[PDB]
Amino acid sequence: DAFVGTWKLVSSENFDDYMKELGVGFATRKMGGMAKPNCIISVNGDVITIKTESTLKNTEISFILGQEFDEVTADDRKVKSTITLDGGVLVQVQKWDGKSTTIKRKREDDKLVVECVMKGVTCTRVYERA
Numbered sequence: 036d037a038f039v040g041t042w043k044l045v046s047s048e049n050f051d052d053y054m055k056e057l058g059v060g061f062a063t064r065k066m067g068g069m070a071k072p073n074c075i076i077s078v079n080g081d082v083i084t085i086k087t088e089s090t091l092k093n094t095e096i097s098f099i100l101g102q103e104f105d106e107v108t109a110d111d112r113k114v115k116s117t118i119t120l121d122g123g124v125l126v127q128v129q130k131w132d133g134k135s136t137t138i139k140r141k142r143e144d145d146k147l148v149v150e151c152v153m154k155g156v157t158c159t160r161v162y163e164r165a
């Protein structure tokens with residue numbers, strides 16, 4: 036849809052602080068901070084697929100809006116995820132151990148803007164079309 040495409044990371048703010056707030060250890064934060072991922076978003080009927088690709092790590096999720104699914108995150112958390120579309124924004128919540136984090140993906144001008152929140156920490160990652 037508005038989101039379908041191949042997106043390349045072009046800026047990031049506060050991603051280390053966000054990872055730290057999630058309890059990610061140094062080695063994984065180091066590799067994650069240095070990563071320059073592509074994000075490939077596709078849709079087929081009810082099912083949306085989001086691939087995140089980088090030199091040192093690839094991940095993928097596929098989901099139906101509103102239907103909770105199990106996910107293993109890049110930092111190896113075992114979470115329950117739900118994604119919904121609200122006002123043109125894909126809103127993802129991950130829940131694990133009584134905690135939650137939100138990841139909001141929006142389209143703004145030429146950008147795919149991703150806002151990641153854990154407690155008081157807010158990270159913004161910006162992608163542009165490949």
Ligand SMILES: CSc1cnc(SCc2n[nH]c3cccc(OCc4ccccc4)c23)nc1O
Nearest residue numbers: 054063066067070072089091092109110138160
């Ligand atoms: C949600 S938004 C988002 C998510 N992940 C990435 S790159 C992940 C990655 N690529 N290579 C990597 C190599 C090592 C570690 C990585 O991640 C760690 C991480 C990701 C997320 C939460 C906590 C820890 C990576 N870009 C984004 O924009």
